Design a protein around this ligand. Structure first.
Ligand SMILES: Cc1cc2nc3c(=O)[nH]c(=O)nc-3n(C[C@H](O)[C@H](O)[C@H](O)COP(=O)(O)O)c2cc1C
Ligand code: SF4
Ligand code: SF4
Ligand code: SF4
Ligand code: FES
Ligand code: FES
Ligand SMILES: [K+]
Lengths: 42, 214, 87, 430, 264
């Protein structure tokens, strides 16, 4: 119930790969993607 | 300032060595899996940004490598890399200082911040220090306007800046230590200075004010 | 892209010899009906004029451009190949 | 009610606006997020859309369009294509930091709102397009999303409601035009940030050609609190048709520039004198206010005396409520220089696709620079007004309108200042 | 009237199929709405904004090249809002367009000049300096003077959709948006002189035809191409008894609007 202290200090120790490492960690939790029926629109 | 054409140079020709690290290829695979099948062209921006984060700047070989990986046209990759302003098509320093110079930062005197930065680094805007440690440019609004004036150094925001504060940040960067982000004026975030006008009470907690029938 | 010159029928003549003037290099001609172009409101009117003046004619039917189905949303198709890659 | 303002802390939605509590899942659950969200999802799409409609929430993006109708545009049977919620988290507009603050301080509100809106419209995923410069905010958002996935609030059983929903975060790469709806859709699809024409509307053909809905972070984040506490409460706040609370970012020449949450229809003088600490030098030292970010025109002190903070009130004041970004300028402000800096911003941020915004905004930037120098004659004021009228309403997207409106406000109010600058330049050269 | 909707152009009724755009309805009635980026065989771009027209009882002008008619719309093609919109868009194009008309191969063949004379104003209010763009070197067939380019993306859409090469595009942003290739690339496929055809300005001109003649000089002879067995209908432009140019002819069943590079 503390209120006089800033509590976003976790953003200080972020490196340049933090976002993509989190995304790679998140990749296992996701549903399979839909398919458009072709490999590419060419 | 910049030119949206490519001239082959010995440092930026399409034979300069760029390739992703294997862990970066794993990250690229996750990025591609974030999108529906047949729409892997949606991963152009994150893969190009990953190339920039690995390499520093973005050479034409890096753009061609991103195009070759994603099987998209290299002209489409060039269109993205030239449209978006966060892509470095030329090498920058170790620290890329971006000083916001839009209207509320100008009201809170970003010009003094810019002039003291030019005096401290010995360079003009848009150019690099000769030791390749600092590039200094002006930018538009960075989305922190109540904390004006502010700069962005790489991925960090340094806010509520005075000339003494920005000189201290430059001293820490030259010394090689992190200057820590956030405001330098003694307030933690966007809160009002000299006390809080709101949110003084503790939050009410779960199940407060819930409508009946839910 | 303007189409205002495709509204009226024209009758022209077969092209004859244009040679080089020895003195000056100009385009000398010998037929008088080289610049003769006649404008008609209708194909049958041009037919009547040609038959009246006793000239053999070749008639080309009017090439009206075909109607085309245009959809701006086809540029952003989910599955079809009409999805564009740039704008 | 007749007078509006003085919003209570127990009625404020963003209870962790200042980052004084834990922004992670434990702190969010202590503050009351993710409460009965399974019951909300089992109540289902039509009930949530009815709750938004009876709340009368309007778009916090700056468009001002009703949220209930806009989200009910996707309340259709599926034609085999997937459906998507897309969250505008770019926050490009000057003067505005509210989306940044709530993304880095209440991210679980944004995640729960993504789930609620995606269930209401029928959606398998929400793509949060965040601003490219907000790297730490995006990483905090990904931490919150990983916490939600681990707790089972997101993904293949949405809080145990037999609903599958995924939340992706996609970063931009520095374009203010990518905060636009269709340009954001194109940027997610991987092309340049160029807006596409309407029709087709994004509820029919949007991201990946699928039906989609682009909604602001503030709108999405206040959606689950609206569902929990009812639309009658949120409609009871604010005036008629301008209902609820609002995040105001007061910046410029004020003593305490800050982001605050206040009720709709609060007087502008009351908001500044209560939360910003007043104008630097005082209310008499106040000169002009841009009330809705850079896209809205300016209003002078005389109409700033009694104006309210409603969409309708600012429309009557010949302005708009944009992102509720109140930029304050005092008597020492070079007002022509400030407006010219805004036009230079729009010149640097135009996507360049369509001719009126491209050529005309560059033209207006050059004319405004000469106006700052005084290097013009007063006929060019009416010429610039006509150029702004040619830009406005003739463009693909509303960046042309948002560049024409500040020029129109400056010409409408501070025209003798421009004429005085031209006269002083003329007499000092000739 | 099954699967047809009745719309009005200047109060005149016309039955059109659903999905017909405003421009197509107006050309069915018989009037040609001004355009720069719309081409009947390219995809809809909608960026030049020359086709802005007024719909009755509607406050905002719509882009006729992209907006489909709904039902009972009265399209006011010659109303004051439409005329003002055309004048404004023409002013915006000619503000940065370079004063190159005597030295430009699009002399009497200029859509920009003709639509300026028919729909724009007669004078300029632009008192500033113009932009200038360095030229590109996409090949010895197409000569690029990209200062004249109005960023209409016709060449980009053609090379993407018909030539199928995906080599052209726009690099940059805002007033600095430039059409071309980012790298020094030679754009050489077959069917590559049709960008010289469909570029409305003289930004993409023909290098063999450079500075040779003018369209009012050139006599037009409608003939057939024999360089292959397709039999593409062409126009031979001859001046003073000398073949000056080969252009295509519109034949929907053979070659549509284009000819091969060898033919051209
Ligand atoms: C040039 C331009 C830039 C915009 N930038 C943003 C932005 O950064 N963030 C945002 O939420 N909306 C932005 N908008 C407004 C969007 O249209 C709006 O957010 C979107 O329609 C979501 O609708 P909503 O207001 O109902 O939530 C921008 C609009 C324009 C024309
Ligand atoms: S108004 Fe400007 S930013 Fe919007 S589509 Fe047109 S060129 Fe792009
Ligand atoms: S393209 Fe047309 S308007 Fe431009 S210089 Fe050539 S003839 Fe003149
Ligand atoms: S070069 Fe010509 S066809 Fe291509 S965008 Fe420019 S004006 Fe259009
Ligand atoms: S205007 Fe400088 S951060 Fe927004
Ligand atoms: S012809 Fe419609 S905008 Fe160009
Ligand atoms: K041409």
């Amino acid at each position: 119930t503390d209120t006089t202290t800033y509590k976003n200090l976790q953003h200080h120790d972020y490196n340049t790969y933090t976002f993509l490492d989190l995304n790679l960690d998140l990749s296992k939790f996701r549903l399979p993607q839909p398919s458009s029926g072709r490999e590419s629109p060419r | 300032g910049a030119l949206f054409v490519h001239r082959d140079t010995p440092e930026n020709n399409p034979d300069t060595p760029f390739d992703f690290t294997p862990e970066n290829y794993k990250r690229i695979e996750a990025i591609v899996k974030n999108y529906p099948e047949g729409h892997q062209a949606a991963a152009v921006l994150p893969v190009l940004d990953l190339a920039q984060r690995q390499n520093g700047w973005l050479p034409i070989s890096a753009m061609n490598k991103v195009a070759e990986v994603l099987q998209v046209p290299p002209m489409r990759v060039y269109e993205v890399a030239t449209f978006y302003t966060m892509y470095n098509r030329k090498p920058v320093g170790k620290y890329h200082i971006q000083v916001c110079t839009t209207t509320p930062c100008m009201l809170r005197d970003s010009d003094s911040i810019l002039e003291t930065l030019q005096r401290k680094l010995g360079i003009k805007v848009g150019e690099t220090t000769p030791d390749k440690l600092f590039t200094l440019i002006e930018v538009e609004c960075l989305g922190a306007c109540v904390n004006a004036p502010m700069v962005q150094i790489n991925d960090n925001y340094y806010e509520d800046l005075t000339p003494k504060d920005i000189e201290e940040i430059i001293d820490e960067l030259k010394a090689g230590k992190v200057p820590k982000p956030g405001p330098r004026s003694g307030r933690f975030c966007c809160e009002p200075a000299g006390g809080l006008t709101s949110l003084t009470e503790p939050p009410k907690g779960p199940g407060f004010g819930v409508q009946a029938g839910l | 892209s303007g189409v205002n010159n495709t509204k009226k029928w024209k009758m022209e003549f077969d092209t004859r010899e244009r040679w080089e003037n020895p003195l000056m290099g100009w385009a000398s001609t010998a037929d008088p009906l080289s610049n003769m172009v006649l404008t008609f409101s209708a194909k049958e009117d041009a037919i009547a004029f040609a038959e009246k003046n006793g000239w053999s004619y070749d008639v080309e039917e009017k090439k009206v451009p075909k109607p085309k189905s245009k959809s701006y949303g086809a540029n952003f198709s989910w599955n079809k190949r009409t999805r564009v890659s740039t704008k | 009610k007749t007078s509006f303002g003085s919003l209570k802390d127990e009625d404020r939605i963003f209870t962790n606006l200042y980052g004084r509590h834990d922004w992670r899942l434990k702190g969010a659950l202590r503050r009351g997020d993710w409460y009965k969200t399974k019951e909300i999802l089992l109540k289902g799409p039509d009930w949530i859309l009815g709750e938004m409609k009876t709340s009368g929430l309007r778009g916090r993006g700056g468009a001002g369009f009703p949220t209930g109708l806009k989200w009910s545009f996707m309340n259709k049977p599926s034609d085999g294509r997937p459906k998507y919620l897309v969250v505008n988290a770019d926050e490009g507009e000057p003067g505005t930091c509210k989306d940044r603050e709530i993304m880095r301080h209440d991210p679980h509100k944004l995640v729960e709102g993504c789930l609620v809106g995606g269930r209401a419209m029928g959606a398998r995923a929400a793509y949060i397009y965040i601003r490219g410069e907000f790297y730490n905010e995006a990483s905090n958002l990904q931490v919150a999303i990983r916490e939600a996935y681990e707790a089972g609030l997101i993904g293949k059983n949405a809080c145990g409601s037999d609903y599958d929903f995924d939340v992706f975060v996609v970063r931009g790469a520095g374009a203010y035009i990518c905060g636009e709806e269709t340009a954001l859709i194109e940027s997610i699809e991987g092309k340049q940030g160029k807006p596409r024409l309407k029709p087709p509307f994004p509820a029919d053909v949007g991201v990946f050609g699928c039906p989609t809905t682009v909604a602001n972070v503030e709108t999405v984040a206040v959606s689950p609190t609206i569902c929990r506490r009812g639309g009658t409460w949120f409609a009871g706040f604010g005036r008629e048709r301008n209902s609820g609370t609002k995040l105001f970012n007061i910046s410029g020449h004020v003593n305490h520039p800050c982001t605050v949450e206040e009720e709709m229809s609060v007087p502008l003088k009351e908001l500044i004198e209560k939360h910003a600490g007043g104008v630097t030098g005082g209310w008499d030292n106040l000169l002009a206010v841009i009330p809705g970010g850079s896209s809205t025109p300016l209003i002078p002190k005389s109409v700033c005396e009694t104006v309210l903070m409603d969409f309708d009130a600012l429309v009557q004041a010949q302005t708009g409520l944009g992102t509720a970004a109140v930029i304050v300028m005092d008597r020492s402000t070079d007002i022509v220089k400030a407006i010219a800096r805004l036009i230079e911003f729009y010149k640097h941020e135009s996507c360049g696709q369509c001719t009126p915004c491209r050529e005309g905004v560059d033209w207006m930037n050059k004319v405004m620079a000469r106006f700052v120098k005084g290097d013009a004659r007063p006929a060019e004021i009416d010429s610039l007004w006509e150029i702004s009228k040619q830009i406005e309403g003739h463009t693909i997207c509303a960046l042309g309108d948002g560049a024409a409106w500040p020029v129109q406000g400056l010409i409408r109010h501070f025209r003798p200042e421009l004429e005085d600058r031209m006269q002083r330049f003329a007499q000092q050269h000739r | 009237a099954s699967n047809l909707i009745e719309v009005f152009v200047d109060g005149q009724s016309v039955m059109v199929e659903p999905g017909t755009t405003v421009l197509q309805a107006c050309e069915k009635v018989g009037m040609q709405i001004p355009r720069f980026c719309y081409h009947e065989r390219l995809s809809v771009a909608g960026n030049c904004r020359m086709c802005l027209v007024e719909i009755e009882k509607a406050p905002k002008v719509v882009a006729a090249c992209a907006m489909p008619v709904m039902k009972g719309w009265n399209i006011l093609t010659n109303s004051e809002k439409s005329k003002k919109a055309r004048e404004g868009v023409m002013e915006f194009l000619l503000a940065n367009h370079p004063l190159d008309c005597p030295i430009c191969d699009q002399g009497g063949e200029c859509d920009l000049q003709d639509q300026s004379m028919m729909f724009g104003s007669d004078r300029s209010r632009f008192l500033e300096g113009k932009r200038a763009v360095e030229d590109k070197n996409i090949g010895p067939l197409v000569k690029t003077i990209m200062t004249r380019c109005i960023q209409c993306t016709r060449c980009i859409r053609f090379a993407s959709e018909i030539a199928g090469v995906d080599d052209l595009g726009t690099t940059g942003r805002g007033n600095d948006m430039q059409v071309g290739t980012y790298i020094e690339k030679m754009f050489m496929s077959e069917l590559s002189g049709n960008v010289i055809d469909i570029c409305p300005v003289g930004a993409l001109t023909s290098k063999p035809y450079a500075f040779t003649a003018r369209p009012w000089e050139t006599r037009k002879t409608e003939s057939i191409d024999v360089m292959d067995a397709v039999g593409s209908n062409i126009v031979v432009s001859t001046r003073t008894g000398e073949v000056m140019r080969i252009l295509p002819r519109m034949h929907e069943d053979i070659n549509e609007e284009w000819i091969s590079d060898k033919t051209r």
